[PDB]
Design a protein around this ligand. Structure first.
Ligand code: CDL
Ligand code: MQ9
Ligand code: MQ9
Ligand code: 9YF
Ligand code: 9Y0
Ligand code: 9Y0
Lengths: 54, 145, 79, 92, 485, 54
């Protein structure tokens, strides 16, 4: 499960405070990617490198 | 455009908020829960070795069976490396289609084997068992990229 | 009063009632649709199933685009 | 932003092609990740046997033997459930 | 059904196709315990794929006490492979085998030796073989530069102060018997053979009309049912022996089975595979069984090149890879017990060899590979578990002997046949299935002979004795099987 | 003769020390890894070994 947490951090970025989306009442944690970000919001997932993740 | 006959409404975003009457279900699949679980187990980890998205289409694929199979495969999330087995009992037809990335991995050799397993099981009278057998045979045949 | 009788009662009446209620309720047709017979026509709407087996780039829908169907073979059968 | 991505090339050497897979254990390639299920089944069975065997001893007590029986029984039940489920393909 | 085929390996695939070509109106039912065709002994990882032409196999050319070389076994195995090749050529021209390159690849066959006495033996072997038309294109190579040019992986870090030699045969093959079996089954199924995957044959009982009741279990549902067959073929690999024991036929009495596993070292590292393009067979170690000859093989599996080294001997009480640990104990019967106990006393050398191979570590397996490729590094090779084979134990006097051959067992009335044993097995599937047809359908075989000769032009002729006919069928078969490309 | 309960604990200590001393060779025999390892691996990245140590 620690490995799974590392992978989720790699593929979604670090977690932060929640934001309510403008048009609708969606709640999104407003993550922060640790690597290059795709043209759209979601980032390009990184590959685990055997080192701790923030 | 029209939502479900009753109780389903388009929401502020794209998602459609749907409802079902208290006594009834939502999936309505005409198969036992256990056999559905077995087929899902197959498609999920008995195909992990193949590393190619294995898909099953029980719906009716009419007119040119091959071409309807092609486009229902196109509808698969990642047709690039995908193997769609379509069965229409209204037409007693099987059609298997493959993605371009799924080539030379033993898939073509496994195609007749999987179709034969499915046909044997169907003539025995077990749609779901035939689907599982075909998935197993095709996954065994297909090698990871 | 009749230690054995009381023990048997407390141990059996729950079991008898459980058996009766299970016969009443567990023996009722469930809401799950009956298995589809091959002879019967296929009435249910088309059912496409997918594995969700491999990794798909990023979970984000945008950027996936439509590269193409890129067919890679075929097969056929008639039961 | 004040973090640099890591590039790692660890020397590998079973080749992991059989056993566990990354989908089940994400870091399968990075270290020992698979214990054969037979090992754990036999270990549980032998632990239950040891618990039962400890009943034979120089204790006039009886709640001790009953606790041993209960713990051995639950261990054997877990081992049997796991073995049966894996025999049937993780069903029920 | 007219015919039941038990198992979906190369034997049943070959017989099912032959019967379907001879008798298109016959009802054929193939029953396979696994969820797909060729997923046991015919799987490309479960066998060496050598396309066994007797070109490289030094155990087929023993030295006699007078220093001459007996080539009789090599000639007979090459002729049996030419029969299989002719059937495959005909099958390609007639659309039975549409994809030649998925199952058959041109790969040189090479005998390899080191040390002065073994080089002299290999020269004597060469001189004996090249007198026969079937081996006339063989080359003898004892030159270092020519060795280095042909086998760059085997030459790297080799000490050439010890003499080395090759017998090189340019026109060898690699065979994916898994692809071949799937294509043959695909043809027979497309022509109305019923296929039953996930179905296990539990029992065989003869009916009063001479037909067979086949008891089948669906492995997915657990349901049991019966099929009535006029003829039964038991192509079930190591699962054949328990089924032939259950059939109660006199001919299967006293047969025991000894399960022998194999393993290979394998690699697909381009820097190794690009430096070795042959099947290279060594000398058997002193006291090794004839099937445990170390070899370093080029394999083409699913269009990808691999190197395979082995086989290392393995042991399992299972008769199949997907078999049961109870297979060996349940194969013991009062009528075969004496034969089985006798093998431990008669085959002490084999038992010692098998124990030695079982005790090998992974580094020690790579050390045996360094005899072929002295530059080999442990991390470039992975262990793969090959197919399970059941060696036949036959009664010999008061004891038993192990048979390393392929044995066709047929009932005296032809109503059932089965295959037991190990080698050359898959490479001789066609002549073995022609023997099954001749023995089991003697009333029809004469009427089939014209159509069998259309499939195999040399049928009933020794190709060693007819060099013109050999060159004709060789040239036709080369072109049709694309073996010149 | 008598074989007191002290021998049980003595053999237990012997086994404990033998296993502790011979673990790296036991681990290499089991897993198969004899590669020259200079980069540590996080305990989470090796579930079986961290499980055994726990
Ligand atoms: C000296 C040294 C001595 C060392 C001894 C040697 C033993 C070797 C190590 C054994 C441990 C191990 O890894 O075993 C693997 C092995 C299981 O194989 P696996 O591949 O790890 O499991 C995969 C499956 O997921 C299989 O698991 P599952 O997830 O499918 O099922 C578990 C769970 C599924 O649910 C969960 O996992 C969720 C947890 C339940 C929610 C909490 C319940 C409510 C509690 C609230 C109370 C609060 C107060 O089901 C249940 O909730 C109950 C099932 C019915 C039990 C029947 C028998 C009693 O376990 C055994 O078969 C051995 C059992 C030995 C018993 C150990 C003694 C204590 C029990 C702790 C271990 C738990 C068992 C694991 C399941
Ligand atoms: C132990 C290990 C990593 C083994 C690897 C697997 C292996 C090769 C096993 C081989 C042999 C066998 C059979 C072993 C099983 C039993 C065993 C370990 C026997 C030998 C015992 C031995 C000589 C050494 C074991 C040493 C070991 C790693 C102990 C745990 C120590 C650690 C890392 C603790 C966490 C660090 C930390 C912040 C500690 C402070 C927090 C506290 C208070 C932790 C709890 C705690 C501890 C740990 C005490 O030791 C203790 C002793 C006396 C009174 C109280 C306490 C106490 O409260
Ligand atoms: C399966 C597999 C792959 C295995 C891998 C192969 C393998 C083992 C590779 C490693 C090879 C090894 C280990 C080589 C030897 C290394 C070595 C010894 C190098 C020399 C070291 C050196 C410079 C000086 C010697 C230092 C030294 C004493 C080393 C040994 C340490 C050990 C193991 C001490 C054990 C002590 C011990 C309990 C011995 C048993 C004898 C008995 C029962 C004595 C009685 C006894 C006494 C006397 C107590 O005090 C006591 C106190 C509390 C409880 C009980 C007892 C008790 O029972
Ligand atoms: C490291 C600790 C973790 C251990 C993990 C293992 C978990 C399994 C625990 C097994 C429990 C076994 C309990 C039974 C044991 C047994 O057999 O003994 C009995 C006493 O029963 C009891 O209470 C049972 C109590 C069981 C509770 C167990 C609680 C577990 C705790 C310890 C877990 C927390 C761990 C904290 C971790 C700290 C972490 C540190 C970093 C009877 O003695 P007795 O008293 O003589 O009774 C006489 C009559 O019989 C007789 O009629 C009458 O006449 C009288 O004579 C009467 O005296
Ligand atoms: C869910 C279960 C629920 C079970 C709940 C039961 C709770 C009641 C227990 C104690 C009540 C107070 C009595 C206290 C006195 C005891 C009664 C008695 O006298 O019973 C006759 C003999 C001993 O005779 P003794 O004269 O004591 O002398 C002896 C040597 N001199 O024991 C026997 O056969 C009968 C057995 C008596 C108690 C054993 C209970 C221990 C643990 C049960 C299972 C643990 C499971 C763990 C699972 C992981
Ligand atoms: C506090 C706790 C107690 C203290 C704990 C510390 C002691 C060491 C810990 C655990 C040892 C047991 C490990 C588990 C051993 C695995 C068994 C097996 O089934 O073999 C599979 C392997 C994988 O091979 P694979 O190609 O990845 O195939 C995947 C197949 N599923 O095979 C092999 O190479 C190895 C086969 C032989 C291994 C022999 C190891 C033990 C040697 C004797 C030392 C005493 C052991 C004491 C045990 C407590």
């Amino acid at each position: 499960s620690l490995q799974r947490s590392d992978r989720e951090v790699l593929e979604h970025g670090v977690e932060t405070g929640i934001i309510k989306r403008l048009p609708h009442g969606a709640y999104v944690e407003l993550h922060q990617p640790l690597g290059p970000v795709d043209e759209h919001g979601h980032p390009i997932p990184l590959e685990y490198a055997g080192a701790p993740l923030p | 455009e029209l939502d479900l006959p009753y109780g389903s409404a388009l929401t502020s975003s794209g998602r459609i908020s749907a409802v079902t009457e208290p006594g009834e279900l939502s999936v309505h699949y005409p198969f036992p829960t256990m056999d559905l679980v077995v087929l899902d187990d197959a498609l999920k980890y008995g195909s992990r070795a193949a590393k190619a998205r294995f898909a099953v289409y029980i719906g009716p694929l009419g007119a040119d069976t091959a071409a309807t199979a092609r486009e229902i495969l196109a509808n698969v999330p990642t047709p690039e490396n995908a193997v769609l087995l379509a069965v229409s009992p209204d037409q007693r037809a099987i059609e298997v289609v493959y993605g371009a990335d799924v080539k030379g991995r033993g898939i073509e050799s496994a195609a007749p084997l999987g179709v034969s397993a499915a046909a044997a099981s169907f003539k025995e009278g077990n749609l779901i068992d035939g689907l599982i057998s075909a998935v197993r045979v095709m996954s065994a045949g297909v090698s990871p990229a | 009063m009749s230690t054995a009788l009381t023990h048997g009662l407390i141990g059996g009446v729950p079991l008898v009632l459980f058996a009766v209620l299970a016969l009443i309720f567990l023996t009722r047709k469930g809401p799950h649709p009956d298995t589809y017979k091959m002879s019967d026509p296929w009435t249910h709407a088309p059912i496409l199933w997918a594995a969700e087996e491999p990794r798909e780039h990023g979970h984000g829908g945008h950027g996936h685009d439509s590269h193409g169907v890129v067919i890679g073979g075929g097969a056929s059968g008639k039961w | 932003m004040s973090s640099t991505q890591d590039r790692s090339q660890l020397d590998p050497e079973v080749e992991r092609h059989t056993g566990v897979d990354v989908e089940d254990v994400p870091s399968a390639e990075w270290g020992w990740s698979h214990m054969p299920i037979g090992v754990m089944h036999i270990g549980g069975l032998l632990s239950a046997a040891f618990l039962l065997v400890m009943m034979r001893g120089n204790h006039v007590g009886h709640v001790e033997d009953w606790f041993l029986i209960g713990f051995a029984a639950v261990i054997v039940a877990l081992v049997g459930r796991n073995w049966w489920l894996r025999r049937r393909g993780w069903i029920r | 059904t007219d015919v039941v085929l038990v198992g979906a390996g190369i034997m049943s695939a070959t017989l099912g196709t032959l019967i379907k070509l001879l008798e298109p109106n016959w009802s054929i039912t193939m029953i396979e315990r696994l969820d797909g065709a060729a997923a046991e002994s015919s799987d490309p990882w479960n066998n060496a794929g050598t396309g066994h032409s007797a070109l490289c196999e030094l155990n087929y050319t023993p030295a006699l006490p007078d220093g001459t070389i007996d080539i009789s076994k090599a000639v007979n195995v090459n002729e049996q492979f030419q029969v299989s090749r002719q059937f495959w050529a005909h099958a390609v021209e007639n659309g039975v085998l549409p994809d030649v390159r998925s199952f058959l690849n041109p790969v040189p066959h090479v005998s390899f030796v080191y040390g002065a006495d073994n080089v002299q033996y290999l020269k004597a072997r060469y001189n004996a073989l090249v007198t026969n038309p079937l081996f006339a294109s063989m080359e003898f190579i004892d030159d270092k530069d020519e060795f280095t040019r042909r086998l760059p992986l085997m030459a790297e870090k080799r000490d050439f102060s010890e003499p080395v030699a090759l017998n090189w045969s340019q026109h060898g093959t690699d065979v994916d018997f898994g692809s071949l079996s799937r294509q043959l089954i695909g043809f027979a199924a497309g022509n109305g053979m019923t296929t039953m995957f996930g179905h296990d044959v539990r029992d065989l009982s003869k009916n009063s009309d001479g037909s067979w009741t086949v008891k089948v279990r669906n492995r997915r549902t657990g349901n049991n049912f019966k099929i009535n067959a006029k003829f039964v073929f038991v192509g079930a690999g190591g699962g054949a022996l328990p089924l032939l024991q259950k059939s109660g036929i006199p001919e299967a009495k006293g047969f025991g089975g000894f399960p022998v596993g194999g393993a290979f070292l394998r690699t697909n590292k381009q820097h190794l595979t690009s430096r070795h393009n042959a099947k290279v067979y060594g000398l058997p170690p002193l006291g090794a069984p004839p099937m445990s000859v170390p070899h370093l093989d080029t394999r083409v599996i699913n269009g990808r090149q691999w190197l395979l080294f082995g086989p290392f001997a393995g042991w399992s009480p299972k008769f199949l890879k997907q078999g049961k640990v109870t297979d060996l104990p349940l194969s013991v019967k009062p009528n075969n017990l004496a034969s089985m106990l006798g093998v431990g006393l008669t085959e002490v050398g084999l038992l010692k060899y098998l124990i030695g191979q079982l005790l090998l570590s992974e580094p020690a397996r790579v050390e045996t590979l360094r005899e072929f490729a002295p530059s080999a590094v442990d991390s470039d090779w992975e262990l793969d578990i090959a197919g399970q084979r059941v060696q036949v134990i036959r009664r010999k006097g008061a004891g038993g002997v192990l048979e390393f051959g392929t044995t066709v067992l047929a009932a005296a009335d032809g109503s059932i046949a089965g295959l037991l044993g190990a080698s050359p097995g898959a490479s001789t599937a066609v002549p073995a299935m022609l023997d099954v047809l001749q023995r089991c359908f003697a009333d029809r075989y004469q009427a089939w002979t014209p159509k069998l000769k259309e499939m195999v032009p040399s049928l009933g002729t020794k190709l060693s004795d007819e060099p013109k006919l050999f060159e004709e069928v060789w040239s036709w078969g080369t072109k049709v099987l694309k073996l010149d490309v | 003769h008598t074989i007191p309960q002290g021998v049980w604990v003595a053999v237990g200590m012997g086994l404990v020390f033998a296993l502790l001393i011979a673990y790296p060779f036991i681990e290499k025999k089991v897993t198969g890894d004899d590669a020259h390892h200079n980069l540590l691996q996080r305990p989470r990245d090796v579930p079986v070994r961290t499980a055994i140590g726990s």
